[PDB]
Amino acid sequence: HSHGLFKKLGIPGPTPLPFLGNILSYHKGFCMFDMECHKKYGKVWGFYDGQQPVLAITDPDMIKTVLVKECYSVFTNRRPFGPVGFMKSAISIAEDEEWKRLRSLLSPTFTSGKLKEMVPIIAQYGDVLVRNLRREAETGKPVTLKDVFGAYSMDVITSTSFGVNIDSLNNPQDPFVENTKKLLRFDFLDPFFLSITVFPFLIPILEVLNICVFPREVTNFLRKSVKRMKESRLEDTQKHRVDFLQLMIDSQNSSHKALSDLELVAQSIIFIFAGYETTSSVLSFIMYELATHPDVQQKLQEEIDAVLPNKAPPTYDTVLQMEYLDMVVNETLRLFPIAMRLERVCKKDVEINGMFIPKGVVVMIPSYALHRDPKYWTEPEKFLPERFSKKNKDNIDPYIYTPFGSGPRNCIGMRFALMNMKLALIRVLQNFSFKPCKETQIPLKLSLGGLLQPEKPVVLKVESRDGT
């Protein structure tokens, strides 16, 4: 019972129940819980995930202090979440100095140059997705976005970490894809995780039995797959394709360095885990918005048609040049910041601009809630891209709008993700128009689970701009 911590500090929040803390209030999902707390408690509030104290903060300066100012010193790590095994070394699960070192070895791998050089590969799959989407529409039936983008997301992943070039969508059974496919984002509200939240003392027991949240079935497979291609393939030299693995392999081969072949395997897997369902979900939200806002869709199409007359293949610089595109992407991320919350564990007693935060408390920034906070957004529930226009985006506080988090521990694949999604969006809109379908849910309703996603999958009628 650390359940008295918050009233002891005079910090408001919902009253916790023995053992459960406040988890039954998650019956409508993390985001609804955070919006309702924001509303009734104010700028700061506390709650308990089992016995774990969580202090939500909403003040921009405090957020910067936590995410930026005091990253290395006090708020360096995310909260532990369950049995992880060797993945304990994935950069996103790694802690303190261990994390700092991994954050160095990997920086170069995510530089624009390395990125630009990966465009041809990803772009190549944009052609594949279009080629693919061409059929699904050409046919007649509504298209289920998660699937088309799931495959596209998959294809970019494999391809950008050694030439495993597969048309994932039409090779549903290619084992290598049938495994990477299983690397889905965790729903921390499913029974298992709720149980570990209420019985955290069970994690060491699962670790000793080698029980891991990532499917060993799949982790084993890729561990071995990387092993061979890391040898078998390029252990022949002469001709390499600037993918993450190679960047990880070569980074290996000539301060703190030397990525353990196991670490490297951990990185490759986490990069997949970090980008697979995230990219696909964001693309789907965007397409939903464009379909329910024809005018925006058209305008986007006109800009694309302008920067690339007559379906001209997208390019790094060409992508960067499109502003309405950038505005549409950003607006969608404001409405659907898929991480939902940003978190940091307080490694030690501290005071940040006024309030004292005890050691061990989890400091949480409710992105979903700050993104829809009336106090900062006119008609928060509305999809209005102008919000991010050139002469308007300056009024946006970066500690309020945080779809990719902020500070030293922000999303390391952010630019890659933005690039990936735009290239895809360009290719697709540069060929089709998505319109609401009779089965299209409007307004879109969000799941009540622990992931930010539509209640029912988004399906839309897809039409080719002059397809005969």
For residue 348, the minimal CB distance to ligand HEM (Å) is 19
- When binding is defined by CB under 6 A, the residue of 103, 131, 134, 435 that contacts ligand HEM is 103
Cβ proximity to ligand HEM: between 339 and 355 the closer is 339
The answer to the question of residue 410 lying near ligand HEM (CB under 6 A) is yes
Cβ proximity to ligand HEM: between 277 and 303 the closer is 277
Instruction: Cite the DSSP H helix spans in 28-91.
Output: 30-41, 60-64
Q: Strand pairing partners for 53? A: 48
| Interatomic CA distance for residues 160 and 178, integer angstroms | 17
- Non-local (6+) Cβ contacts of 64 within 8 A are 399, 406, 407
Closest CA relative to residue 399, chosen from 69, 107, 48: 69
The answer to the question of residue 159 lying near ligand HEM (CB under 6 A) is no
The answer to the question of residue 412 lying near ligand HEM (CB under 6 A) is yes
Stretch of residues binding ligand HEM (CB under 6 A), selected from 37-45, 203-211, 298-306, 411-419: 411-419
Place of tokens 């360096």: 76
| Interatomic CA distance for residues 69 and 299, integer angstroms | 40
**Tokens matching residue 88:** 């304990």
Pattern 252-291, ligand HEM, x by CB under 6 A: ------------------xx--xx--xx--x---------
**Tokens matching residue 28:** 């409508």
Q: Is 31 annotated as a binding residue?
A: no
The answer to the question of residue 146 lying near ligand HEM (CB under 6 A) is no
Cβ proximity to ligand HEM: between 103 and 134 the closer is 103
* Residues contacting ligand HEM: total by CB under 6 A: 25
Pattern 16-55, ligand HEM, x by CB under 6 A: ----------------------------------------
- When binding is defined by CB under 6 A, the residue of 405, 434, 440, 453 that contacts ligand HEM is 405
Stretch of residues binding ligand HEM (CB under 6 A), selected from 46-54, 246-254, 377-385, 401-409: 401-409
Upstream peptide bond of 443 is cis (omega within 30 degrees of 0): yes
Closest CA relative to residue 90, chosen from 159, 186, 189: 186
For residue 4, the minimal CB distance to ligand HEM (Å) is 29
Cβ proximity to ligand HEM: between 38 and 341 the closer is 341
CA-only gyration radius of the chain, Å: 22
For residue 338, the minimal CB distance to ligand HEM (Å) is 5
Q: At residue 463, what is the residue type?
A: E
Angle at 269 between CA 263 and CA 271, to 5 degrees: 100
Cβ proximity to ligand HEM: between 106 and 196 the closer is 106
| Interatomic CA distance for residues 363 and 366, integer angstroms | 10
Cβ proximity to ligand HEM: between 14 and 366 the closer is 366
| Interatomic CA distance for residues 462 and 145, integer angstroms | 10
Handedness of CA 354, 356, 360, 361 (dihedral sign): negative
Handedness of CA 191, 196, 198, 202 (dihedral sign): positive
Known binding site: residues? Answer: 411
Residues annotated within the binding site for heme are 411
Contacting residues toward ligand HEM, per CB under 6 A: 67, 91-92, 103, 270-271, 274-275, 278-279, 282, 338-339, 342, 403-406, 409-413, 416-417
